[PDB]
Amino acid sequence: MATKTSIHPSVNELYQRLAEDQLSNCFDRFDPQEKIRCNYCELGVSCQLCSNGPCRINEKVGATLGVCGINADGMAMRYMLLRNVMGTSTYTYHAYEAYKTLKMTALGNTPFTITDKDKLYQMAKDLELNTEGKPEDVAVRLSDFLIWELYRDYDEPGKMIEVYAPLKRKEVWRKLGIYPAGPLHELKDAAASCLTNVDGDYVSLATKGLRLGLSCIYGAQIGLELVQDILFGTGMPHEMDVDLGIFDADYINIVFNGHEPFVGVALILAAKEAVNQDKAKAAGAKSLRIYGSIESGQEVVQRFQKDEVFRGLTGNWLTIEPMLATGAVDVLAMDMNCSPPNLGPLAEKYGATLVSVSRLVRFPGIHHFLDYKPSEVREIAQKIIDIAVDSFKNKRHGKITPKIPANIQKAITGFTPEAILKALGGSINPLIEVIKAGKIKGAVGLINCTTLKNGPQDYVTVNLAKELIKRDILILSGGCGNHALEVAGLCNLDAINLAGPGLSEVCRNLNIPPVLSFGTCTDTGRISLVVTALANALNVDTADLPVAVTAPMYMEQKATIDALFALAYGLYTHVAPDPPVMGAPNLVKLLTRDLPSITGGRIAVGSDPVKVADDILAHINDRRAKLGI
Amino acid sequence: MATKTSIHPSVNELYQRLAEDQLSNCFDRFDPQEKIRCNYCELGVSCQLCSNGPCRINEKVGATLGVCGINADGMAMRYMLLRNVMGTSTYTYHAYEAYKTLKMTALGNTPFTITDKDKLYQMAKDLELNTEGKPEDVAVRLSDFLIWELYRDYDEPGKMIEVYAPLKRKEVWRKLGIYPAGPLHELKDAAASCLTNVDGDYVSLATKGLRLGLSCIYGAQIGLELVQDILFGTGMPHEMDVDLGIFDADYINIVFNGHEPFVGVALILAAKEAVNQDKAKAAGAKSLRIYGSIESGQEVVQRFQKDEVFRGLTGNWLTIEPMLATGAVDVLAMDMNCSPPNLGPLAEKYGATLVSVSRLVRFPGIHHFLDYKPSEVREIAQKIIDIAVDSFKNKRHGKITPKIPANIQKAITGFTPEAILKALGGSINPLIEVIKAGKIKGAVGLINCTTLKNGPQDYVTVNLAKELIKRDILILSGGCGNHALEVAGLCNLDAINLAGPGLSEVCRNLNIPPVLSFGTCTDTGRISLVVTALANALNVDTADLPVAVTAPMYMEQKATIDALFALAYGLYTHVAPDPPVMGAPNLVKLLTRDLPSITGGRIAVGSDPVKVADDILAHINDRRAKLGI
Ligand code: SF4
Ligand code: SF4
Ligand code: FES
């Protein structure tokens, strides 16, 4: 086939089974869409927002404006803003559930506990909360405070942004009028702006997008990730097994898949109970095992070890259909994106049971719906185990032929700001030393999805990462793009020898890989803590640091909201494939050429790994020169 | 000339001036878009939500599913849900500002007061709030409670829905799982569901649309309209002037345009100050006048009299460009949709000044930006007056040639539930008796925009209304469609001559027109109070009543969210033009054929006035037969 598949042999092997079984799958479905691609939509110059449409910009035939009067620049930026309301809403949804989960845990009504009490008290102190009473009392106050940050209106000052952002950024944001309200109000204001005949000004709409990105990081992401650390521990580096060879057909295999890790943690706790292992053995299995997929899986591997029960990370979202084709999964428990909506016929062919554990996730052919509530997660996890044992006995065992690829890779996971400081001996200064000396030229935040638009699964991401480390650029990674680097072997100690002269030397001395796994796209806020620490140590603004961000195989608006944040934060932000805006020439000029004089950041483009890496290195070296290094 | 223009002569005269002046306008811009219409988008079977797209459904080349695996029905319903997030967001934005305006008024910080104190105390008692102390204390408490209704989550029981919705409906909603959270959480949940690889199930997406409609009416619309009644009075029927002949070129003319009435009320109060009338006269004007446009204008005409200062209502949103072509406007002050984004060049040519009074409203060529805050609205109004005096002197008077059409129509505005009860002698019983006897066959809620898609401006709306009243069907109207019927003369006593024999008899006896102006699309919740009262008097469910809803020239999602509410409320709901759904056969079946067995309601379609009226009458007669009347 000339069908774009994957850079990973395990996925290519399983794609062959899908094709031979004549089952629909993302790789094959790309080809028919390629025959009929709409150029207007590709360029951002179509609109479907009201009944006078649908409209298109085509100046050659006199269609210079939409019926309502909007121009191409406003049209393109408006649809970008509307889609980014979806991205912000997902992070806001997740944060709210994290805060309710901490509150209910503190009240004693979940299987969870308060694990990182030091972080709980430090956060409460930094936010000037009352710290008297028991740890549980403090956790309740923190949960209510972080809910207040979600709800804050555009007229009440926030505290998270003051604690966690650097000084010069705050001044820039106040000058521009982009200090945000809470994300719930900001996303509502953004959506209202996009209604027909409201905001048709591309500069205004772009500014609203920048505000929305700031609200997402300071108003949702930083709080949610620190709360998940309080519940489940702060990650430290440890070795993890990845890729699809981690499966063994003789066990009952439950896979959790999504972004929110609460059900997965409850499943691991329940699977460790003897009553449930005994059930699996009586059903004919060797034992019962739990596995993570995509971002929920990554959240767990950041904080938990591989053991007899929890087995590691399968892969990113384009691995889900291949995973079912192993014929080894008993339950796939899905909590959020990505849960692709044609899994039904694959689950039927390969003998797997599909369980949704969120009211958000629905599609044809799901077998069970167990919507999450903190006070019911113990019961949900036990029901899932019961379903999995019956599915193994009645659907899979003795009926489905397994075809599990042999590929397994090792990755060191669980890097956090805290783990970096520890690896440096307690201070950031040794990292500053090696950057000033030129051994490490700079650092890149790789915050990405995966997609088929600009290559086989993960092709641009992995090859770009190789080119960056060759140029002595350290990578901090999150998202489906992080899962790709783990599976490709860039996150273990052998990868030291893939780096250039200075970075390989530093990594060898510190005993760390040249790509540091920081988790998920939800950890963009956490990555900003590292960049903010560098800004303070060098006493410079973030826009002047030798850093950059890349989302090189972006798919949807969890990544683009992080890119909008990076722009507001003053950074060179590479995005591929092109977002649908290139038919809007004044918008393109704003994002790629004029933003350095506004926020300090800019959008960069392209899918050639060498050219993209060269352009990033040139920016880094420009920053270095002005710093005197 | 074959161009689609308007049913209204005044608009047609002003279109000729726009054309002579070679200025772009909605009527002329429709033609170029016609030449290149995308049939995939017309049918709802294109998607632009992620980078693997843009996708289209075309079975001939094997493009049966999007790359992600979503089918045509999920694709169409998902984009409908996302767009209705925008609609819900505008109502939620408006409600929040109304509640902050009431609270700040109670604290003494605005030019407004507590006008309908009886409504304040009755609403507080119905909601079981503390009524001790000062009226201002009660108003603060009510404002805080209604803000809580906006913010309540999916697991916290509402009170507005219990007070204002009937039990038989509440039982259906609980059985279906569509009892909503507050609108802020509901709209965030809906947006998150629309992200790629989250909710791809058309039945689930439709159900989430019904929930969203319920959250909008009970969590935003009823509260905001009753709070506006508390601030500005409860409407009673009175005579108003409408259409573009109300302008006079020798006065300073300030037009307020949008949905939120706060700036408009402040302008009327400021214009009544002798110092401001004196400024106008010293500038060469006869005096200073305020006019209302679209929904903000309608809110004011519902509650305020015509006098020497406030002159009435210009018309609906397709009248805005023609209105500027009169060469009589000094300031257009814009607070929300509809503010079409190419007004700039028209304002320049005709010598009018554009002022935005909301952070939502931005587009090229606006002259001043005065974002609303309750504590600043007194200063905003004064600044607008000073701007208008300068503009009259320097831009318009004696320099721009006015061309004001002669047309003025009379309309009886300000119908409310309270006004209907008063006209009936204090109870709904007389209306029940004339429905039972067959003098009035049934009643229609016409809750509508205007558009060019399915005819010249207001052609379908006005002619459908005429066909309905001829069939002895009473109309309650709101929205741009209400402005259309007012301008067409269907809302005065002369219009009784066009009603059928039974309705004309009732109208003459009660001294009311056959079309009752209930205000805006934001008054859908208020209209439900009348429908709930009819169902209670007859001891039946709302789905059993001889009523229907029509949005016969819908444009955007302020109207569609009201249609989704009407479906959830069990009603036959006619919508034209077709929403972009007709390429999705199972979604079409759900909405048009299966919903009667689910909620009781159904979507009806079509743009022929006679056929649409006959289909509505047939539904009414089916309901009557089942009731035995
Ligand atoms: S919002 Fe404007 S450009 Fe978009 S469909 Fe409506 S008339 Fe066309
Ligand atoms: S969400 Fe699915 S159908 Fe829509 S553009 Fe992405 S791959 Fe195509
Ligand atoms: S698919 Fe309709 S304009 Fe692109």
UniProtKB/TrEMBL annotation, chains A, B:
Q: Name one GO biological process term.
A: generation of precursor metabolites and energy
Keyword annotations: 2Fe-2S, 4Fe-4S, Iron, Iron-sulfur, Metal-binding, Nickel, Oxidoreductase
Protein residues bound to [4Fe-4S] cluster: 47, 50, 55, 68
Q: Which residues carry this modification: Cysteine persulfide?
A: 521
The record, for Pfam families, names: Prismane
- Recorded GO terms, molecular function? 2 iron, 2 sulfur cluster binding; 4 iron, 4 sulfur cluster binding; anaerobic carbon-monoxide dehydrogenase activity; hydroxylamine reductase activity; nickel cation binding; peroxidase activity
Residues that bind [4Fe-4S] cluster 1: 38
Q: Where does [Ni-4Fe-4S] cluster bind?
A: 259, 338, 449, 480, 521
Cofactors per UniProt?
A: [4Fe-4S] cluster
- What is the E.C. number? 1.2.7.4
**Keyword match Repeat:** no
SUPFAM superfamilies xrefs? Prismane protein-like (SSF56821)
Amino acids binding [4Fe-4S] cluster 2: 47, 50, 55, 68
Question: Is this entry keyworded Iron?
Answer: yes
Binding of [2Fe-2S] cluster: at which residues?
Answer: 38, 41, 56
Q: Catalyses which reaction? A: CO + 2 oxidized [2Fe-2S]-[ferredoxin] + H2O = 2 reduced [2Fe-2S]-[ferredoxin] + CO2 + 2 H(+)
Matches recorded under PANTHER family = CARBON MONOXIDE DEHYDROGENASE, HYDROXYLAMINE REDUCTASE
Please state what the protein is called: Carbon monoxide dehydrogenase
Q: Which organism is it from?
A: Carboxydothermus hydrogenoformans (strain ATCC BAA-161 / DSM 6008 / Z-2901)
